[PDB]
Amino acid sequence: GWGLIFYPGNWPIIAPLHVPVEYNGMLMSIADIQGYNYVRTGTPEYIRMVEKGTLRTFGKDVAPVSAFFSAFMSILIYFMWHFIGRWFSNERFLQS
Amino acid sequence: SAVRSHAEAVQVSRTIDWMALFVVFFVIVGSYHIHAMLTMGDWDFWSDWKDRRLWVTVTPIVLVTFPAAVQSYLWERYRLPWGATVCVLGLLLGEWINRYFNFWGWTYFPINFVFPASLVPGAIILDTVLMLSGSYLFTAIVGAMGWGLIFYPGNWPIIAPLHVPVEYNGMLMSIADIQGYNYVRTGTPEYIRMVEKGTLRTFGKDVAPVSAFFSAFMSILIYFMWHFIGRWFSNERFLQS
Amino acid sequence: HGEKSQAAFMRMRTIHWYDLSWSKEKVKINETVEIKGKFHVFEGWPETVDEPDVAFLNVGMPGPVFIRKESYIGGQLVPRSVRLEIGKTYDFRVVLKARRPGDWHVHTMMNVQGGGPIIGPGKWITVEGSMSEFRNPVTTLTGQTVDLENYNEGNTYFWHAFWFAIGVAWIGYWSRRPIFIPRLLMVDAGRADELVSATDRKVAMGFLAATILIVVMAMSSANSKYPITIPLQAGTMRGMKPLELPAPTVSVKVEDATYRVPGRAMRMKLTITNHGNSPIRLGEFYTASVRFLDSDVYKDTTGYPEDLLAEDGLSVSDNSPLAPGETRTVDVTASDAAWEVYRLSDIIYDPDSRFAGLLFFFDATGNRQVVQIDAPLIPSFM
Amino acid sequence: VPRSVRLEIGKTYDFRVVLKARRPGDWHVHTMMNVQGGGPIIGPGKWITVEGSMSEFRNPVTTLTGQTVDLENYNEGNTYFWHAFWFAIGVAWIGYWSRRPIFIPRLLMVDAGRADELVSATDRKVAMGFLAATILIVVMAMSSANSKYPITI
Amino acid sequence: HGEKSQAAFMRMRTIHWYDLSWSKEKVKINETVEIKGKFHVFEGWPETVDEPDVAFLNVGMPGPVFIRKESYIGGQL
Amino acid sequence: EAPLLDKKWLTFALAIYTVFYLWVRWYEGVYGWSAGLDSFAPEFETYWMNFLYTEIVLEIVTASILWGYLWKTRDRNLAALTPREELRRNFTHLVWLVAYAWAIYWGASYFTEQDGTWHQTIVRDTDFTPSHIIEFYLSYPIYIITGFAAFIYAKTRLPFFAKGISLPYLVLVVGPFMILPNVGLNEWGHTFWFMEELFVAPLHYGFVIFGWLALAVMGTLTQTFYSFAQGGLGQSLCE
């Protein structure tokens, strides 16, 4: 649930930022125009790890596949960090 | 009492033996087959992937995993020395069933192009070494050396007729190479095959022995680790939450 | 099959397959079909696809319904992966041999390492006959002619059955006794040493020695039977000869390119300059395997897959002879159900709304010039 | 060139950059080429003076849907509202349990073996209601956002 | 020494060394010997060898029996 | 005085899986070519998406009904269980384990390599290929249901397994279940990470890892044997 609910929970916030715009002859997003206009001198455009399309990308399945992969890895990480915290909760005393 | 006589107890024990053999065999088939295919199945599917460098190196190292654990359980608890043999037999049975009924029965790939690799001699060597020595360290070292080294000589009688040179359309080709060329794998282009292509540091006819010895050493390491992995997997623990 | 689900811009911006021919539409078993054509590598190669430094020419079909007898790139046989350069055009030829009967959709494809599949136009081919009649004769350098359908099958069966039987015998030797419960109780009780006898040790020694000796003898016999063997032949073949084509005496600039999102068409404003070659006229726009043609200027006679051929899908505001030198700005409209059927309208889901394609110009004498266009594609919603 | 580009070694390129003044003051402005796997390549810097007030800056953008917006304040209120709403929900969830003794008595009760007495049926019903309300609110908010903005890229 | 054991096709398909000259055949200690020639890079470079984007001109000998006073590729040290 | 081992139940456990999966293979052969190749076509819809929906609904209903029935009819008082009835229940649990092993073979071994074959002969177009529909969404849920049912029966009928949650049984039963969520990684592996149809790619190591958990069966087996022997069978057999 934690993996799956992340994107639907944030969609009401980022939805108005994905309205298409014809900016200087090129199709742009409102978030894309925000990144373009407000210059990040230390953060060029090539650094952003965003989807750019693959020849193995299928018919409108990017977000659900990402959500399910995130949920599975969340299961794994929760299982490991439960025991990590169990170790962190030890009440031990040392003599040296 | 549960049983009324000693003969009834013996018969019940024999029935349990058969049923538990079925359960162990087919659970091993499922798990070992999924592990084996998703670790080394591209070399095992096609005859033109059976090279001297990558196939010989990779296959025994990844396939020595389950026999180590199953031996560590069976020999320790029942003195049954057939763990490696049963693992290899189950993997071979599953692979052959898939090749005959799916690779050939569905997509009509010729059987001589899609056949698995022989693995019984290595399992036999491992099992006999474990039974005769009785110690897991000596078994690990010597049996894994034998398991790594015997893989390619055991399979050579099968793949030897497929390496006869042919002058195909002006280019030198192998029979396995022509098999891969003619029978089109739409989802498996030619560049994917991890086969030896020659290096400037490749020496005078030492590819296969070097690959075999490297595979034997890594087989020693993997057997040593998976023995303890199986020892953990054999724990009889109960949880309260 | 498999292209409709690929991103529209990736299909538009990778490889363009132009004039193609199929020798036959219906073939019998063991008969050969030849597919020839040209493919152009787009200059604006997508960044998520690796450059075609390692590329393989492949045939897309649901299996070995055909066997690829040979494949040539630029007149050179290409059984291995090859290296292609961005922005160059190459001839390709593929000769296939019919193996299984039925109707098969056959495509020419370029598999690119670090990129994935690039499928070209697919054609329906009918194979009539029986699969039992298919033969694959190959003559070796040792003077032996073999049939690849059944060659070495019996040897593989024999060896696998032999080793499986040996393993089964090894298991069954121990399986004649109580297996699980009594042995477990004896081991727990400390009587493990009673579960293995001297005869069992001798049997294990014999099994090990026999296995090693049989492996050695089998290797020696195989070496004697086949004293001449070579390793698997692999590698990437460089130095592919590209086409040296006439540069287009025609210059085309894309002012604007738009598509209605509901939409089954695409519209573009183009400025065209004729640099000689007599009065010319646009006859065809090729986008992603889809060819929009202007019936009055050009007609296909190559049996181009009809699902991808729009005989009157090109509407040019003014398609009159463009006198050499004339610079006319025209509004072209490419319309066809293939736009929606081949999911080219799904460019609305693409993280890159830019298109690329080919324009074909014909003069009075019929000479053809190919112009390459690329632009961003703007969706229209109002 | 709103995106990253590919440059060839040994070639010369014209470049043009049009900037719009936003904040007053004296600013040293440089043209630079950020290169992936290389780092920054800064060019000559020039001092430019901007006079006025930052409150006068406007960034109008016209969308393909026929709407003209100002990028300085667009979608600000929606983000504030949603973040405050979810933060308030989390605070309420914590404060429902925070009305009782928190750390020491509960720890002693758990150590004593009376953990089952620390959660009642009403608490279970409240947790079920919280979970159901969270899921339903997320679904309804996604549906409403889709209805409000049916065209997205 | 070390070429006979290298794959024949790798030796055939990498670099070709054409007209070469050695200034002297017998030298004394502290005397200099010049080896000049031309080398051509084969167009069909093998795929298992990386492209010579980073290449070093070296002298093959059983050790510092000589010292490489200088080396020039195209007249440039 | 019913026989200790019910041969009819074991025969049914083998035969139902055998017949159902043979029919599934026949369906794959008949409709995997005419309709399964193209995913954006109506015949593909009516012949595979309907199959997927029906199999998902039936799997959910069957799992719910079977698990609820097994948990509802649990033996409230296991102290009065006679040794003969305990041995009969042990044999029934062994039949359940046989069914679980058969389902595991059908799912993890047969259809997984069939999926490998399918991916090596065609170009992948969707996540819901007929091979994916049969393998990920039919056989895996079936063996998950069988394993959960076997675990519940062992916990609710055998006093040996009723004293707590068996760790080896839990690992053997839940471990392979994690293969089903891991399919998402597989999809994320093929659509974004790896552009090639390579079966040895790391994106499949998840499967592999959870396959290792099936080895827990050995530990479970040991417990089963003790559950068979603590009732007096071991004492009579040792004589």
Ligand SMILES: CCCCCCC/C=C/CCCCCCCC(=O)OC[C@H](COP(=O)(O)OCCN)OC(=O)CCCCCCCCCCCCCCC
């Ligand atoms: C967050 C990283 C965890 C670090 C590992 C956990 C600490 C080590 C545990 C095992 C050995 C010590 C015994 C039990 C622990 C607690 C501990 O150190 O107790 C004192 C013992 C001596 O006590 P004793 O009565 O004689 O018997 C052993 C106690 N179980 O010291 C030792 O055994 C050796 C020194 C302890 C280790 C150093 C302190 C660890 C704290 C982190 C160091 C900083 C690194 C992080 C910075 C980013």
Ligand SMILES: CCCCCCC/C=C/CCCCCCCC(=O)OC[C@H](COP(=O)(O)OCCN)OC(=O)CCCCCCCCCCCCCCC
């Ligand atoms: C195959 C992967 C192995 C997973 C790791 C082994 C399990 C964990 C062991 C240590 C903590 C638990 C105690 C001993 C085990 C067995 C176990 O979980 O016993 C119950 C205990 C409570 O028992 P206790 O009498 O109070 O004392 C502890 C028992 N030694 O639970 C716990 O301690 C916490 C929950 C157990 C962990 C979850 C189940 C693990 C099964 C795998 C989960 C699925 C992941 C794989 C899917 C692909």
Ligand SMILES: CCCCCCC/C=C/CCCCCCCC(=O)OC[C@H](COP(=O)(O)OCCN)OC(=O)CCCCCCCCCCCCCCC
């Ligand atoms: C109760 C039986 C004992 C328990 C073990 C199960 C053994 C059962 C075997 C069934 C044999 C009949 C198969 C023919 C189907 C008979 C069948 O279904 O035929 C139709 C399809 C073909 O349909 P199509 O595709 O539309 O046709 C066009 C292209 N052929 O063929 C097949 O399905 C045949 C190939 C696959 C058959 C499966 C293999 C047999 C299963 C073995 C299971 C492993 C058991 C291990 C035991 C050691």
Ligand SMILES: CCCCCCC/C=C\CCCCCCCC(=O)OC[C@H](COP(=O)(O)OCCN)OC(=O)CCCCCCCCCCCCCCC
């Ligand atoms: C579980 C309780 C039942 C409730 C329903 C469950 C979820 C919904 C539908 C089930 C039917 C399956 C088909 C999906 C609708 C199918 C669906 O709606 O797909 C939408 C898009 C496809 O977009 P498009 O091509 O433009 O559309 C045309 C498709 N021919 O795909 C996706 O979103 C991909 C699916 C999401 C990735 C998850 C795949 C599952 C992986 C297995 C692990 C996860 C499962 C958890 C195990 C416990």
Ligand SMILES: CCCCCCC/C=C\CCCCCCCC(=O)OC[C@H](COP(=O)(O)OCCN)OC(=O)CCCCCCCCCCCCCCC
């Ligand atoms: C798997 C377990 C079954 C229950 C969950 C249902 C499974 C299917 C989808 C949920 C994953 C998140 C949505 C993305 C899917 C994958 C999916 O369907 O993605 C398409 C769009 C995203 O597309 P885009 O290109 O970004 O454009 C925006 C258009 N909305 O999301 C959706 O359509 C959302 C689908 C469902 C949203 C409701 C989420 C509620 C369910 C998850 C919580 C479950 C926790 C249960 C508690 C016990």
Ligand SMILES: CCCCCCC/C=C\CCCCCCCC(=O)OC[C@H](COP(=O)(O)OCCN)OC(=O)CCCCCCCCCCCCCCC
């Ligand atoms: C990403 C993968 C999941 C994360 C891994 C952790 C998940 C759960 C279990 C795995 C390891 C932790 C279990 C605790 C050890 C197991 C544990 O709980 O204690 C072992 C003993 C306890 O100390 P002791 O009393 O002195 O020794 C006598 C036995 N009681 O540790 C030691 O002896 C020293 C080693 C302990 C190191 C554990 C540190 C935990 C890791 C913190 C690092 C951050 C997390 C990294 C993962 C990203």
Ligand SMILES: CCCCCCC/C=C\CCCCCCCC(=O)OC[C@H](COP(=O)(O)OCCN)OC(=O)CCCCCCCCCCCCCCC
């Ligand atoms: C051990 C009991 C004694 C029995 C003999 C042992 C094995 C055979 C010969 C021993 C003599 C050594 C020279 C080999 C014949 C040497 C030999 O036959 O080499 C064949 C090829 C060479 O082919 P070529 O150049 O065309 O031939 C001309 C060579 N000038 O090399 C190889 O196959 C390479 C050797 C195989 C790689 C293993 C090297 C050893 C690494 C050490 C670890 C393994 C040792 C285990 C430690 C316990």
Ligand SMILES: CCCCCCC/C=C\CCCCCCCC(=O)OC[C@H](COP(=O)(O)OCCN)OC(=O)CCCCCCCCCCCCCCC
């Ligand atoms: C190292 C321990 C000593 C005992 C083993 C002998 C060591 C040397 C070689 C064996 C490794 C496999 C063969 C490849 C070598 C390395 C080697 O010699 O490779 C050359 C050819 C392979 O060349 P190719 O290009 O593929 O062409 C085929 C020509 N045969 O193999 C051989 O000549 C085979 C050599 C020996 C085969 C007999 C194997 C039996 C020994 C191994 C089992 C030992 C287990 C003992 C049990 C306790």
Ligand SMILES: CCCCCCC/C=C\CCCCCCCC(=O)OC[C@H](COP(=O)(O)OCCN)OC(=O)CCCCCCCCCCCCCCC
């Ligand atoms: C590739 C490298 C070789 C593989 C590694 C394994 C080889 C042998 C030993 C190394 C680790 C396992 C030894 C057992 C731990 C050591 C072990 O056997 O038990 C430690 C305890 C046992 O549980 P307990 O009774 O509750 O704790 C009190 C102490 N008895 O585990 C724990 O407490 C939890 C952690 C146990 C995790 C071990 C899982 C084994 C790994 C399975 C994964 C698959 C294999 C991965 C390797 C590829």
Ligand SMILES: CCCCCCC/C=C\CCCCCCCC(=O)OC[C@H](COP(=O)(O)OCCN)OC(=O)CCCCCCCCCCCCCCC
């Ligand atoms: C697929 C083909 C299948 C091959 C089947 C091979 C047969 C396998 C096992 C036979 C088990 C007989 C065990 C008898 C002990 C039964 C046994 O132990 O009898 C007491 C004898 C007494 O013999 P003795 O005379 O007093 O002392 C020895 C010298 N006289 O002890 C023993 O130690 C007898 C040892 C005999 C072991 C024979 C096993 C050898 C099997 C090798 C098979 C080769 C593979 C096939 C080659 C093509």
Ligand SMILES: CCCCCCC/C=C\CCCCCCCC(=O)OC[C@H](COP(=O)(O)OCCN)OC(=O)CCCCCCCCCCCCCCC
């Ligand atoms: C930012 C906005 C903040 C939202 C604040 C929401 C309020 C949160 C919690 C209220 C706690 C009341 C607990 C009363 C139990 C107090 C309680 O337990 O009372 C005994 C009742 C007896 O009821 P009964 O009639 O005998 O049996 C049920 C049918 N008649 O038991 C219960 O089980 C009562 C359960 C009531 C639980 C209500 C909690 C629901 C809260 C959902 C909030 C939705 C979020 C906002 C939507 C926009």
Ligand SMILES: CCCCCCC/C=C\CCCCCCCC(=O)OC[C@H](COP(=O)(O)OCCN)OC(=O)CCCCCCCCCCCCCCC
């Ligand atoms: C005709 C073939 C042979 C007979 C068929 C019965 C099975 C074969 C042999 C053993 C019994 C033979 C005599 C039985 C006579 C009568 C009969 O059919 O008995 C079997 C069960 C009764 O189970 P029982 O009370 O434990 O007692 C069995 C011992 N005789 O019948 C039922 O009606 C089923 C019991 C209720 C549980 C239903 C399970 C949930 C069903 C929903 C679907 C589940 C999921 C589906 C998959 C996704």
Ligand SMILES: CCCCCCC/C=C\CCCCCCCC(=O)OC[C@H](COP(=O)(O)OCCN)OC(=O)CCCCCCCCCCCCCCC
């Ligand atoms: C916990 C699970 C970990 C995995 C362990 C099981 C094996 C699984 C995968 C790797 C098997 C090799 C075949 C590739 C399939 C796994 C796979 O798909 O590998 C792809 C690469 C080739 O493509 P690529 O573009 O290079 O992609 C890199 C992704 N790994 O294969 C390779 O093998 C090359 C990658 C480098 C890894 C070399 C193999 C390991 C060499 C030995 C060191 C490791 C320790 C060994 C033990 C001593």
Ligand SMILES: [Cu+2]
């Ligand atoms: Cu097709």
Ligand SMILES: [Cu+2]
């Ligand atoms: Cu082009």
Ligand SMILES: [Cu+2]
């Ligand atoms: Cu020399």
